[PDB]
Design a protein around this ligand. Structure first.
Ligand SMILES: Nc1ncnc2c1ncn2[C@@H]1O[C@H](COP(=O)(O)OP(=O)(O)OP(=O)(O)O)[C@@H](O)[C@H]1O
Ligand SMILES: Nc1ncnc2c1ncn2[C@@H]1O[C@H](COP(=O)(O)OP(=O)(O)O)[C@@H](O)[C@H]1O
Ligand SMILES: [Mg+2]
Ligand SMILES: [Mg+2]
Lengths: 49, 244, 243, 49
């Protein structure tokens, strides 16, 4: 009943400086942290993450 | 319903109770059986075969290896009591009854007409078996030869949506339409054909006996004649309909 | 047109055969275009995407077009995929006009479709099965091959063709040993598969009445007479003056 | 990009508009390529100029 909330959003762009902007389904644009689960190499702007 | 602060599924389902089509289901249950309307006596038996009898005993159909009928398509003179014949079966079977005026569909908002009829059909499957009465097919039956540039495609879209729901890809849902027209010349070759409307029925003008039947029902709501002779009455009303 | 691309790809390789990118079906209704689409769906088991051409175009501007893109981008992930488009009658306007809501906005959702099936953005492996009643209210882009490379005409089933339809429905029913399907298909000349279903159900209504499981020859001919009579009339007239 | 915890500009951003499938999609790759100038050949000559 307690399954944690993980927000879903779609990538606005991929930054050259090794970061990514991603838009939450809340609304507010965020710059996220990369990770080794899903890289910026499986992703493109519009990718649902 | 989601338990907030983790916002995960905790409770199925409060969905959805949508009055837009939910509210056009049952008509407070019909008080009309086929013993409160006559005159179209011969037609009535045909209709009981196509709709009521599967429900009464399915096994008679399973037994002959046949698909049961998809209901009846009525044409005839306006006002003969096609509505009241739909009502008579619905009541008797003790199944779900969805009465839609079918001309109130077709919005001037594009494909909204189609959307709406998609919901009424879906609604039928969820509460299957359900008998649907689709009245008036003179404002939802399209014309393939142009006559209104904005009109033809719009009525067509709505029309082919409901056909799609009827047996296009999707199950019947044990509908059992039950749908009244008065013109068979305004229908498209797509809907005209059976397997969507298995037994195409001619509803004619009431016979000599039929005037008499209808008459006895209505004079029992009145104070009735004191110099009874119904042979006289029948003669005059020849050339008219059940509503008259 | 879809079996060989999945099951025989070495053929494609060896000979050098460009792949097919769709099949267009047209022909009078009730004949079993929908039955063929299901059968393919069941029996090649790969991603069977069923959509409907009246479902495109909703009450907001350009919603119908939005919806087409969603479908193509999902089809591209799911390839091999067959998109089965049911109904092409209301979605296409052979004629063009401007500033009409049934004849300009039905054209802005047509233009997104022409245009993802094949086009600049591929495909996937679709193999898009379109089916319609009439091509005479169907835009020519679809009509032309290139994409929808096999232009499959469908007629009303043949003399022999109709005898087989009868026999499928009878395979599920029963029969008597006086029954002759050929005589019945004759009468029912120029009739689609759907009509035949109604004959066999209606004949079944006579058998029921008389309390029998099997359908006999008499019951069928009785059903051809019954169904037809109630659809168009016979009485009228002799002179007077025409005698 | 503002510091999330309390606000202040911490990153200029090289500045974007939301490219998605717009300018991001560069495709001109095979089958259709420049090895396949099928035509209608004169038409392509006009475009080249
Ligand atoms: N060849 C056939 N043999 C047996 N029954 C058939 C045949 N064709 C159609 N039917 C029956 O009629 C039903 C309805 O027709 P169906 O939806 O298959 O038609 P369609 O040719 O795709 O038509 P449309 O032009 O209306 O799009 C079928 O699901 C089936 O039960
Ligand atoms: N056979 C009939 N018996 C009783 N009332 C009738 C009959 N036919 C029609 N009417 C009456 O006439 C009116 C209009 O006919 P209605 O049944 O609504 O039909 P339809 O849907 O065929 O136009 C109603 O008030 C209805 O009660
Ligand atoms: Mg009425
Ligand atoms: Mg079809």
């Amino acid at each position: 009943l307690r399954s944690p909330p993980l927000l879903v959003g779609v990538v606005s762009d991929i930054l050259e400086d090794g970061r990514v902007v991603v838009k939450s389904s809340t609304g507010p644009k965020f710059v996220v942290n990369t990770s080794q689960y899903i890289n910026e190499e499986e992703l493109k702007p519009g990718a649902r993450v | 319903a989601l338990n907030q602060q983790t916002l995960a599924i905790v409770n199925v389902l409060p969905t959805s109770k949508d009055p837009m089509v939910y509210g056009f289901e049952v008509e407070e249950k019909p008080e009309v059986s086929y013993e409160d309307i006559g005159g179209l006596d011969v037609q009535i038996e045909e209709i009981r075969e196509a709709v009521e009898l599967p429900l009464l005993k399915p096994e008679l159909f399973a037994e002959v290896g046949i698909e049961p009928p998809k209901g009846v398509l009525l044409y005839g003179p306006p006002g003969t009591g096609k509505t009241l014949l739909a009502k008579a079966v619905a009541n008797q079977t003790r199944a779900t009854f969805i009465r839609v005026v079918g001309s109130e569909f077709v919005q001037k908002y594009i494909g909204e007409g189609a959307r709406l009829v998609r919901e009424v059909f879906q609604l039928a499957k969820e509460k299957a078996p359900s008998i649907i009465f689709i009245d008036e097919l003179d404002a939802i039956a399209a014309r393939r030869t142009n006559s209104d540039t904005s009109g033809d495609r719009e009525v067509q879209r709505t029309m082919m949506q409901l056909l799609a729901e009827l047996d296009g890809f999707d199950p019947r849902g044990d509908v059992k339409v039950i749908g009244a027209t008065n013109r068979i010349d305004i229908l498209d070759p797509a809907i005209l054909r059976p397997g969507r409307f298995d037994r195409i029925i001619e509803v004619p003008l009431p016979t000599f006996e039929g005037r008499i039947q209808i008459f006895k029902i209505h004079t029992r709501k009145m104070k009735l004649a004191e110099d009874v002779d119904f042979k006289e009455l029948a003669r005059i009303t020849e050339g008219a309909s059940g509503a008259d | 047109a879809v079996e060989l691309p999945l099951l025989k790809p070495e053929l494609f390789a060896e000979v050098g055969i460009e792949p097919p990118k769709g099949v267009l079906l047209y022909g009078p209704p009730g004949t079993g275009k929908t039955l063929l689409a299901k059968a393919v769906a069941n029996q090649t088991r790969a991603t069977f995407i069923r959509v409907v051409g009246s479902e495109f175009v909703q009450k907001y501007i350009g919603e119908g077009a939005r919806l087409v893109r969603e479908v193509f981008q999902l089809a591209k992930e799911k390839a091999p995929s067959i998109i089965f488009i049911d109904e092409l009658d209301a979605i296409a306007a052979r004629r063009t006009n401007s500033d009409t809501s049934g004849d300009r906005e039905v054209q802005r959702t047509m233009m997104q479709l022409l245009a993802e099936l094949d086009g600049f953005d591929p495909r996937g492996d679709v193999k898009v099965i379109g089916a319609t009643n009439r091509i005479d209210i169907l835009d020519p882009a679809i009509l032309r091959p290139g994409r929808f490379d096999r232009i499959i005409e469908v007629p009303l089933p043949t003399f022999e063709g109709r005898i087989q339809i009868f026999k499928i429905h009878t395979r599920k029913m029963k029969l008597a040993e006086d029954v002759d399907f050929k005589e019945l298909a004759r009468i029912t000349e120029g009739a689609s598969g759907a009509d035949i279903k109604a004959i066999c159900t209606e004949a079944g209504m006579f058998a029921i009445r008389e309390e029998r499981a099997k359908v006999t020859m008499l019951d069928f001919t009785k059903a051809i007479e019954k169904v037809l009579k109630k659809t168009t009339p016979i009485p009228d007239l002799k002179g007077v003056m025409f005698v």
